[PDB]
Design brief:
- The chain is mainly α and 115 residues long.
- It has one domain: Histone Acetyltransferase, Chain A.
- 57% of the residues lie in helices and 0% in strands.
- It is built from five helices and no strands.
- Helix 1 runs antiparallel to helix 3 and helix 4 runs antiparallel to helix 5.
- The longest helix has 21 residues.
- This is Bromodomain adjacent to zinc finger domain protein 2B.
C-alpha cells in the first residue's frame, strides 16, 4: 500500500529474455501455422469467429516497439495464439497438433526462464 512495498524483483533483462524465447518459437519446425497473420480475405469464417487474431510476427513487432508494458502482457499474446488455434482447428489435424506442441514448448521455456 502507500509507502509499503514488497522487495524489488529485477526486471531489467525481461525484454531481452522474451526476445530469446520468441526467437526459439520462430525457429521451431512446427511454427509454420503461426509465423504470419491468418489471411482474413482467404480463410472463410476466421474474421467473424476469432475476435482477436494474434501471430508471431505481430508479437515480434509489438515487442520491438515497446508495446508490451510487462512480461505478463507478452505471455498473454503468446497464449492467445494457441487459444485461437484450438478454437478453429480440430485436435486431430496437422495444425491442431502443431498448436499443442508449441504451447508445451513455450510453457516449459517460460517456467525455466522466470519461475
Amino acid at each position: 500500500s502507500m509507502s509499503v512495498k514488497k522487495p524489488k524483483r529485477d526486471d531489467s533483462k525481461d525484454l531481452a529474455l522474451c526476445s530469446m524465447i520468441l526467437t526459439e518459437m520462430e525457429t521451431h519446425e512446427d511454427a509454420w501455422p503461426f509465423l504470419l497473420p491468418v489471411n482474413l480475405k482467404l480463410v472463410p469464417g476466421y474474421k467473424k469467429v476469432i475476435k482477436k487474431p494474434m501471430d508471431f510476427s505481430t508479437i515480434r513487432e509489438k515487442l520491438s516497439s515497446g508495446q508490451y508494458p510487462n512480461l505478463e502482457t507478452f505471455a498473454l499474446d503468446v497464449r492467445l495464439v494457441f487459444d485461437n488455434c484450438e478454437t478453429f482447428n480440430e485436435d486431430d489435424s496437422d495444425i491442431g497438433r502443431a498448436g499443442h506442441n508449441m504451447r508445451k514448448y513455450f510453457e516449459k521455456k517460460w517456467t525455466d526462464t522466470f519461475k
